[PDB]
Amino acid sequence: YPKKGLSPLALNTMDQFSSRLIPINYDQLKKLDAGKQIKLETTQVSGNF
Amino acid sequence: LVAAYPIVGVGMEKLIISTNEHASTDQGKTVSRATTNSKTESNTAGVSV
């Protein structure tokens, strides 16, 4: 999701009703500024049948 | 005899703090020029003996 020919999906919010873009304080900004990278994990997935 | 019963509890790994300050820097320059024109006029008397 999406298919093979389309661009990826964007996430930038954290509410239930989308507002309040994700913040980062000053030390994490200076660590991310100097070459480092974040890692993304998946904990669980809910769905339907 | 034994009961079906779930028991849970949570545990702290780390804690991260993030402050709130509003720093500010300013930088300025200035250039000025002035002229002056004036005129005086004086009188003198005197007596010696």
Side-chain angles (χ1 to χ4, degrees), chain A residues 25-28, chain B residues 16-19:
Chain A
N25 79 315
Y26 203 49
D27 277 278
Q28 283 143 24
Chain B
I16 317 163
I17 63 185
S18 65
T19 63

Side-chain angles (χ1 to χ4, degrees), chain B residues 2-8:
Chain B
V2 284
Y5 193 49
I7 287 162
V8 293

Side-chain angles (χ1 to χ4, degrees), chain B residues 16-44:
Chain B
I16 317 163
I17 63 185
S18 65
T19 63
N20 273 330
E21 283 217 311
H22 195 272
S24 175
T25 79
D26 285 332
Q27 161 164 5
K29 289 162 60 180
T30 172
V31 169
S32 157
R33 167 172 288 254
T35 62
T36 300
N37 300 309
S38 44
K39 164 205 200 69
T40 87
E41 185 167 6
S42 45
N43 283 306
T44 300

